[PDB]
Every structure is written in structure tokens, then in C-alpha cells.
Amino acid sequence: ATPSLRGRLARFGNPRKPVLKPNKPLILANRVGERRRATCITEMSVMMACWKQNEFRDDACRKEIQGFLDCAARAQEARKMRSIQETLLPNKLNKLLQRFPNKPYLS
Amino acid sequence: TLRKELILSSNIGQHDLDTKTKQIQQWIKKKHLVQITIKKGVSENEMEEIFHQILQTMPGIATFSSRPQAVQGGKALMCVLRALSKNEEKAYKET
Amino acid sequence: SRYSPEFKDPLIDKEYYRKPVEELTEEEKYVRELKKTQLIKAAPAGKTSSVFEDPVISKFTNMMMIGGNKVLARSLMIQTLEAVKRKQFEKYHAASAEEQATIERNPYTIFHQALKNCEPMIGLVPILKGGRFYQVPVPLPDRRRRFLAMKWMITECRDKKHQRTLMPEKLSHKLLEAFHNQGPVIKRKHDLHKMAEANRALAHYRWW
Amino acid sequence: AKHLKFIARTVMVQEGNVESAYRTLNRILTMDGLIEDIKHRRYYEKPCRRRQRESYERCRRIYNMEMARKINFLMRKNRADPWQGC
Amino acid sequence: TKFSIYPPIPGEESSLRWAGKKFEEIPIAHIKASHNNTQIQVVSASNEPLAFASCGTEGFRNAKKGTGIAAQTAGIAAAARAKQKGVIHIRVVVKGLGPGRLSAMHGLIMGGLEVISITDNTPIPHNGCRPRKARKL
RNA sequence: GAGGAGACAAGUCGUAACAUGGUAAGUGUACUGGAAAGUGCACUUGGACGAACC
RNA sequence: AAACUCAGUUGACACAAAAUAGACUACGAAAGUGGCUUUAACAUAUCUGAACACACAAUAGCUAAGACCCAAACUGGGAUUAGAUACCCCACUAUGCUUAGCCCUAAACCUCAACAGUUAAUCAACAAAACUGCUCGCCAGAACACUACGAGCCACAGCUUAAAACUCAAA
Ligand SMILES: [Mg+2]
Ligand SMILES: [Mg+2]
Ligand SMILES: [Mg+2]
Ligand SMILES: [Mg+2]
Ligand SMILES: [Mg+2]
Ligand SMILES: [Mg+2]
Ligand SMILES: [Mg+2]
Ligand SMILES: [Mg+2]
Ligand SMILES: [Mg+2]
Ligand SMILES: [Mg+2]
Ligand SMILES: [Mg+2]
Ligand SMILES: [Mg+2]
Numbered sequence: 006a007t008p009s010l011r012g013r014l015a016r017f018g019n020p021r022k023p024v025l026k027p028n029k030p031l032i033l034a035n036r037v038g039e040r041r042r043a044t045c046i047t048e049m050s051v052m053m054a055c056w057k058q059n060e061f062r063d064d065a066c067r068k069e070i071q072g073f074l075d076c077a078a079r080a081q082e083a084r085k086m087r088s089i090q091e092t093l094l095p096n097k098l099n100k101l102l103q104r105f106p107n108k109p110y111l112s
Numbered sequence: 113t114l115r116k117e118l119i120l121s122s123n124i125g126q127h128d129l130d131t132k133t134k135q136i137q138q139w140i141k142k143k144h145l146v147q148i149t150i151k152k153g154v155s156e157n158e159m160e161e162i163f164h165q166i167l168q169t170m171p172g173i174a175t176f177s178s179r180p181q182a183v184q185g186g187k188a189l190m191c192v193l194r195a196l197s198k199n200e201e202k203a204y205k206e207t
Numbered sequence: 208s209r210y211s212p213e214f215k216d217p218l219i220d221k222e223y224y225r226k227p228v229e230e231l232t233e234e235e236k237y238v239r240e241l242k243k244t245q246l247i248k249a250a251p252a253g254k255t256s257s258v259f260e261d262p263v264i265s266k267f268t269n270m271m272m273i274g275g276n277k278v279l280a281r282s283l284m285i286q287t288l289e290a291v292k293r294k295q296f297e298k299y300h301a302a303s304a305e306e307q308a309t310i311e312r313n314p315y316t317i318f319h320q321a322l323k324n325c326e327p328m329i330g331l332v333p334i335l336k337g338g339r340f341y342q343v344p345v346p347l348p349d350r351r352r353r354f355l356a357m358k359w360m361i362t363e364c365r366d367k368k369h370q371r372t373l374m375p376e377k378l379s380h381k382l383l384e385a386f387h388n389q390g391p392v393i394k395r396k397h398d399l400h401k402m403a404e405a406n407r408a409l410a411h412y413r414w415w
Numbered sequence: 416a417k418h419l420k421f422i423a424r425t426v427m428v429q430e431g432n433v434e435s436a437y438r439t440l441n442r443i444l445t446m447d448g449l450i451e452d453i454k455h456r457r458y459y460e461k462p463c464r465r466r467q468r469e470s471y472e473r474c475r476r477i478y479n480m481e482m483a484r485k486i487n488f489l490m491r492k493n494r495a496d497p498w499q500g501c
Numbered sequence: 502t503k504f505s506i507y508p509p510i511p512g513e514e515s516s517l518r519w520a521g522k523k524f525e526e527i528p529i530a531h532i533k534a535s536h537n538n539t540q541i542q543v544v545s546a547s548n549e550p551l552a553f554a555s556c557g558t559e560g561f562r563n564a565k566k567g568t569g570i571a572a573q574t575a576g577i578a579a580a581a582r583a584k585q586k587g588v589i590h591i592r593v594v595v596k597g598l599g600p601g602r603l604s605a606m607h608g609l610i611m612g613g614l615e616v617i618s619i620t621d622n623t624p625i626p627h628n629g630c631r632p633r634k635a636r637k638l
Numbered sequence: 639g640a641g642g643a644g645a646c647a648a649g650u651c652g653u654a655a656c657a658u659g660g661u662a663a664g665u666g667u668a669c670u671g672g673a674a675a676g677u678g679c680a681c682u683u684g685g686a687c688g689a690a691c692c
Numbered sequence: 693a694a695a696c697u698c699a700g701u702u703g704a705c706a707c708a709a710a711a712u713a714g715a716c717u718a719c720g721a722a723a724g725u726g727g728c729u730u731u732a733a734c735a736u737a738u739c740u741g742a743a744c745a746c747a748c749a750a751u752a753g754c755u756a757a758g759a760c761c762c763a764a765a766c767u768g769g770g771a772u773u774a775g776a777u778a779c780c781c782c783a784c785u786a787u788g789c790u791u792a793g794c795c796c797u798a799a800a801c802c803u804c805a806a807c808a809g810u811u812a813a814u815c816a817a818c819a820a821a822a823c824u825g826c827u828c829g830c831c832a833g834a835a836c837a838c839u840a841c842g843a844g845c846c847a848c849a850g851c852u853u854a855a856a857a858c859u860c861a862a863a
Contacts, residue, residue, distance in 0.1 A: 116774085116775075117773095117774050117775080118774065118775070119774050119775090132775085135775075135777090138777095147774095149774090
């Protein structure tokens with residue numbers, strides 16, 4: 006349930022001091038806001054610690070290095086899949102709101 | 113040693129010159145190196161007269177760490193003021 | 208580009224076209240049938256169906272080229288391969304049978320393994336958080352890794368420290384050192400790794 | 416201080432997934448408002464600023480709840496155009 | 502019995518055990534994730550100090566202390582010390598929303614110690630003292 | 639004599655206000671500072687917080 | 693950077709402030725009031741009615757005596773800067789707290805007076821729709837001017853009331 010707006014704003018016929026002071030009018034707009042915008046650092050840390058204690062000789066750090074590389078490839082794959090999945094959408098929702106616009110006036 | 117730099121103009125007003133001279137005196141008391149540069153708003157002698165006027169207000173307090181020198185293609189003059197050492201101050205007192 | 212977007216790069220591979228029809232999945236058969244009606248770019252003058260073709264060596268030659276001197280770049284590449292093979296043969300002959308089993312004489316394998324050893328696993332990239340760029344460590348994709356290995360090899364060979372030493376011999380010596388996991392190129396890879404580890408604390412500055 | 420320990424704000428990890436345990440604890444603190452309260456209490460929010468922020472948050476919540484109600488109400492009308500063409 | 506996120510109640514007869522010990526007897530790994538420093542002290546069930554590890558004590562200095570990596574390092578060091586001092590399972594109690602809050606636990610586990618409970622003891626005054634004034638940058 | 643205001647009127651030192659004016663602005667009051675002004679406490683919106691979930 | 697060699701756990705411990713509830717919208721004339729309990733207690737069966745008196749009036753501030761965790765004008769130190777009498781960091785005082793007096797000001801604003809009534813034939817713009825009756829208060833170009841003078845006041849760098857001259861065609 007939405008918070009009550011009865012006797013909240015400073016208006017004539019409202020004896021009490023205002024409860025809310027909205028900078029913008031509290032009227033639904035015909036549109037919604039736009040969708041607002043590191044990875045795999047633990048494997049990197051493992052690989053780098055092994056390098057630190059081994060003098061950066063990859064021959065005996067092969068396992069950690071392969072894990073790090075595979076995890077980076079998985080990160081790129083995840084970026085691609087997330088992009089395609091992202092592509093209700095704000096555009097469709099704005100179309101729906103346009104179809105049923107808010108009428109704060111008379112007609 | 114902290115270096116405090118100032119940039120002045122040949123046609124600087126007397127009141128502003130006094131304000132900046134007070135600031136320079138405070139710096140000298142604090143024992144900083146005051147690099148004063150003067151630009152053309154004039155002759156080099158007249159511009160150096162401003163350095164002499166500023167140092168006049170500090171008879172036995174400040175001195176020229178570096179003497180006036182023409183820099184910026186001769187457009188500007190530059191000098192470095194420093195507090196007088198203990199020995200220099202004692203010599204001034206003896207004088 | 209004189210080629211319209213409808214043009215596709217040719218696929219030069221004899222086995223691909225000689226593959227039996229029964230071995231083709233539905234998608235592969237669809238791809239072939241579609242290619243039957245697609246414009247194809249003329250085969251570039253660099254690659255052919257020759258069984259001795261090596262894309263890595265071709266790319267190395269291209270990177271070593273200066274001002275369109277493909278002939279000279281190819282000459283240097285073949286001279287380097289010949290020098291590597293001759294040095295390995297000399298070591299194999301001068302070495303006892305016990306280590307002759309391990310001594311490698313295939314210059315192409317030596318070159319591939321040298322570049323692979325030179326490949327850096329992690330690079331340093333400028334990443335910006337709040338308005339300041341920092342050399343944050345980051346994984347390097349495969350293309351970037353291979354390119355960095357090749358470029359480091361070429362630049363180290365091109366350095367002026369080696370005077371009156373021809374590029375064939377310089378590159379052969381450096382490739383052998385890299386194959387044995389030594390030399391300035393591997394040293395540079397280790398320096399990159401060391402700097403990345405030193406700046407490890409900035410990993411979170413990455414956002415992707 | 417004068418209460419018993421390990422009862423308040425304590426979660427038990429299941430099968431050793433401390434990440435899941437910490438996510439649950441963080442959800443608990445956020446829903447109870449402790450995270451926001453700590454962030455706001457880091458510096459002293461003067462009473463007028465506090466009142467303005469509270470009013471702004473109340474208006475934002477009213478608007479968001481009404482917009483969500485409208486969206487959920489109209490979501491059914493996202494069907495396929497039945498009278499396509501005419 | 503079924504797994505319940507609520508901790509066992511002292512005095513209540515419970516079948517839960519860790520290394521043959523009740524919940525009230527497990528060591529406690531107090532973490533403190535300040536704004537720019539993460540401290541980790543592992544004490545016994547009778548508040549007997551066992552281990553300590555901080556981002557500052559781990560060689561990190563200045564801003565480096567207030568990072569997840571430094572917190573992991575401190576957690577690993579504390580876990581190692583506690584392991585050598587005879588600690589297997591721990592009740593983790595963390596008081597602070599600093600960057601090391603979760604990284605300290607991650608390091609404390611990577612160092613070997615298992616966690617059975619995570620406790621948030623961030624001091625939240627019911628007003629009381631007045632904090633310092635806001636920053637205008 | 640000196641102050642205050644206004645105007646005429648070109649300069650000197652800053653860039654305080656007008657954009658989130660680059661530290662939002664302002665009221666009351668106190669201290670401080672060539673100087674616009676800085677800061678503390680409370681107050682105002684004559685600012686905003688991007689207005690479904692993220 | 694400066695600063696402190698103090699820091700963590702546990703236990704004891706305020707004359708400071710009053711998470712969540714509160715997405716409630718209440719109480720009071722306004723200022724104000726959001727921890728718990730109790731006591732006392734929230735004027736007027738007709739409305740308006742103070743520069744013409746009585747009683748209040750946040751914060752700041754003064755006087756004297758206490759408290760002091762924390763915060764904090766001023767001051768001191770670090771840093772930044774051309775400079776930095778600021779913004780950023782640290783320390784600390786007046787001050788915020790209690791008692792008894794003063795002080796009597798706020799963008800004290802919901803910038804929308806009290807009371808009664810209407811929604812009908814709208815309404816410069818914006819803002820918080822347009823009006824009717826009645827009453828008091830106030831206003832009559834800008835700036836000079838929250839000023840000078842006079843007067844009153846526990847106020848002595850103050851507050852309230854408050855002009856004129858010169859100037860302009862604007863504000
Ligand atoms: Mg400005
Ligand atoms: Mg400003
Ligand atoms: Mg202010
Ligand atoms: Mg100041
Ligand atoms: Mg009356
Ligand atoms: Mg009155
Ligand atoms: Mg008062
Ligand atoms: Mg005090
Ligand atoms: Mg008010
Ligand atoms: Mg006044
Ligand atoms: Mg007066
Ligand atoms: Mg008078």
C-alpha cells in the first residue's frame with residue numbers, strides 16, 4: 006500500500022504544517038528511468054602468489070596459470086552472454102506508458 | 113625548506129603591494145624561501161625597484177637568497193628572498 | 208574497401224572441402240549450401256594450400272617487414288629457420304646419445320615453443336575510476352598475448368646492442384634462448400609479471 | 416554490551432558457503448536498515464538535512480510505488496496486437 | 502533436525518558439534534574493518550588471545566591498508582597463526598563496514614580456518630555520541 | 639578634520655555570486671580574515687539527488 | 693603528511709544524546725516536541741481584535757556557578773595552492789549540557805492572516821485551483837536603508853520603530 010498523501014503537502018484547507026515538500030510535482034510521468042549501468046580476482050591472486058614464491062617461473066605454476074586464463078576466457082564469455090541477455094526493458098515499458106498515458110488535466 | 117612563490121605586476125597597487133609584503137614578511141618569519149617574480153603590467157630597473165622596496169620593509173629580517181635575474185625572455189624579473197641566518201643577524205645587530 | 212560487405216573471406220583448406228558429405232552435421236551442410244551462393248574475396252597473395260604454410264611464421268614475417276619488403280622479410284625468416292636448424296643439428300651431432308633423444312631439431316617447433324614461452328599471461332592497462340588512470344593488471348586475450356610475444360622478439364632482435372650481427376643470427380640465438388626459457392625476451396615477460404604483481408593491489412580498479 | 420553474545424546479527428553457515436552466509440547477513444542488515452544507518456552516522460547529518468532527506472525519500476517511495484502499481488496494472492496489455500492491420 | 506540459520510542458544514541442549522566442541526566453546530575471530538585498516542584477533546571461548554593480524558602489521562601502509570587485498574593478507578596471517586595455535590572452526594564476529602569486511606573472512610578461510618557463524622557487531626549507537634561534521638569537497 | 643551614500647569613472651589584488659559557479663546558495667548569530675568572504679550552531683529551498691526493480 | 697604509541701578482546705562505568713517504530717502525520721499559539729515511568733496539564737459555548745499592553749519566542753550570544761563523553765567557531769600544526777587568513781587531515785578552547793538570570797533575533801517561510809461560506813459562472817505567468825462576506829495588520833518606483841537622528845529596552849560592536857538629502861529611469 007502506498008503511503009497516504011492526505012494532508013501531507015502545504016495546501017489551502019490543510020491546517021497542519023506540510024509533511025512533504027516535493028521539489029517536483031507528485032504526478033506520474035509517462036516514462037520510466039533508463040536502465041543504469043573487476044572480475045575473477047581470486048584466481049589472479051592465486052597465480053600471482055605462486056609466481057611470487059616461485060620467482061615467476063610459469064613451468065611449476067602451470068595449473069594456476071591455466072586456471073587464470075580459463076577464468077579470464079569465462080569472464081569474456083559471461084560479458085557476451087550478459088550483453089545478449091540484456092538486449093521489462095525501459096523502451097517497451099515507455100511504449101506501454103505512452104499507450105496508457107497519465108492525464109493530469111481535464112478533457 | 114618550503115618554497116613560496118609570488119607573481120606581481122609592474123603596475124601593482126600600493127595597497128596590494130603592502131598586503132603581499134605582509135605575507136612575505138610572515139613567510140620569512142616562518143623561514144621559507146620566497147621566490148618573487150615580477151612581470152610587465154616599464155623598465156627592468158624600475159621593476160627591480162619593486163624588489164628593493166619590498167626588501168626595505170625587512171631591514172634585518174630578509175635578504176636575497178638569489179639576486180634579481182631577467183627570466184622569461186627578459187619579460188619578467190625573478191628573485192629569491194630568505195631569512196637572515198643567525199650569524200648574519202648577529203652581524204647586523206653588531207652593525 | 209573495394210569489397211562490398213556481401214563478400215566473405217575465402218576458406219583455403221583442402222581437408223575442409225574434401226571432408227565426406229556423410230560426416231557433415233545439418234548446420235555444416237547448411238553452411239556449405241549457403242556458401243554455394245555467397246560472393247568470396249579473392250585469395251590474398253600471402254596464404255595458399257601448401258602443406259608447409261605456417262600462419263604464425265607468416266605473421267612473424269609480416270611483423271618483421273619494413274616498408275613493404277616482403278622478399279627481404281621472408282629471406283630473413285628462412286635464414287633464421289635455417290640457422291636454428293643448423294645449430295640444433297650441430298648440437299645433436301656433438302651431443303651424446305643420452306641427450307640426443309631430447310635435443311630438438313624441428314625449427315618450426317622451436318619457434319612455436321619460443322613464442323609460447325614469451326607469451327605474457329597478464330598485462331598492464333590504464334583503467335580509470337573517478338577520473339584518474341592507473342596501470343591496473345588485467346588478463347591479456349590470446350591475440351594480444353601472441354602479438355606481444357612476437358613484437359617483443361622482433362624488438363629485442365632489432366635492438367642496437369647486437370652490432371654487426373645479422374638479423375638471422377640474432378633472431379636464431381634469441382629464439383633458442385626463449386625455447387630454453389632464458390634470454391632478454393623471457394626477462395621482459397618476467398618484468399611485466401613482476402610489475403603486475405607489484406600493482407596487484409589495484410586489481411579492483413578494473414570494472415570489466 | 417549487557418546483552419548475550421552471538422544471538423544478535425549472527426548467521427550460521429550452511430555446508431561451509433561463507434559467501435552465502437555473508438550474503439544472507441548483508442540482506443538482513445540492509446532490510447533492517449543498519450547498513451544505511453551506519454553510512455549516514457559516519458558523519459553528523461544536521462537535523463534540517465535529515466528532514467529534507469527523509470521527505471525526499473518519502474516522496475521518492477510514493478512515486479516509485481505508484482509507478483510500480485501502474486506498470487503492474489498495465490503489464491497485461493503487453494499482449495500481441497489483436498487487431499493488427501486494422 | 503534441519504539446518505537453521507539461527508545460532509544454537511546457550512544452555513539449550515543441542516546436538517550440533519564442531520571438532521567435538523559445542524558452539525559456546527568454539528574460538529571467536531573478531532574482525533574490525535575500519536575505514537582504512539582491517540584488524541583480526543582470534544581469541545578462545547574464554548577470551549584468551551591466540552592470534553592477531555592487521556593490514557598495517559602485514560606491511561601495507563597508508564591507503565594500501567584499506568583494500569580488500571590487504572584484508573585478505575591479514576586474514577591469511579591470522580588464520581595461519583590460529584591454526585598453529587590449535588584452532589579449526591571459528592565463530593566470526595566483524596564490527597565495521599570497511600573494505601576489509603568480507604575480504605578478511607575470505608583470507609581467514611584461505612588460511613585454513615573454517616567458519617561456522619558470521620556475526621555483525623558493528624557498533625550502532627541509538628544516537629548517543631555526536632559524530633564529526635560532514636565533509637565539503 | 640574626518641566618516642557614510644550616490645554618481646562619474648579607468649585601473650590594482652582576488653574570483654565571492656549567477657551552471658551542482660568549480661566547497662549549492664541564503665537567514666539569524668559568534669569568532670576570524672587585504673578583500674570579496676571562511677567557519678561553527680540552528681533554520682529555508684528562493685538546489686539537486688537522475689524519480690518501477692536494479 | 694602531520695598526530696598518538698598506543699591497538700584488539702573481556703568486565704565495570706554519564707549531569708552527553710535519545711537506532712528501529714516513523715511507509716505514522718499526532719501534540720502545541722508559534723518557537724518547538726519522536727528513550728521509559730509517574731504527577732500536574734493542554735484558555736474561551738460567538739467571531740475579529742495590539743508600535744497600544746501582558747506572556748512566550750529555535751540557534752547564536754552575555755553573566756555567575758557546575759558537568760564535559762563527543763562535536764566544535766577561534767587558535768596551533770600538516771597538506772594543497774601563484775597565494776589559501778579557505779576547502780582536506782590532526783589537536784583543542786569558547787560553545788552545545790544543568791541551575792538562575794539576561795538577550796529578544798531567524799529563508800521565525802507552509803514566504804499563502806483570523807473567522808464563515810461556495811464550487812458557480814475558471815484563470816496574466818509560475819506556485820499550492822478560483823472566489824465571496826467580514827475584521828485587523830501592512831503596502832504605494834529603485835537605491836540611500838535590517839541606515840542617520842529621536843525614543844524605548846538588564847540590551848553598550850545590540851535590538852525594535854525608522855527617515856531625509858544627493859542619484860536614476862528604471863528597479
Ligand atoms: Mg566562484
Ligand atoms: Mg559555491
Ligand atoms: Mg553557510
Ligand atoms: Mg577560518
Ligand atoms: Mg480573539
Ligand atoms: Mg501581535
Ligand atoms: Mg530566545
Ligand atoms: Mg568544552
Ligand atoms: Mg521554522
Ligand atoms: Mg536583523
Ligand atoms: Mg539599527
Ligand atoms: Mg540611536
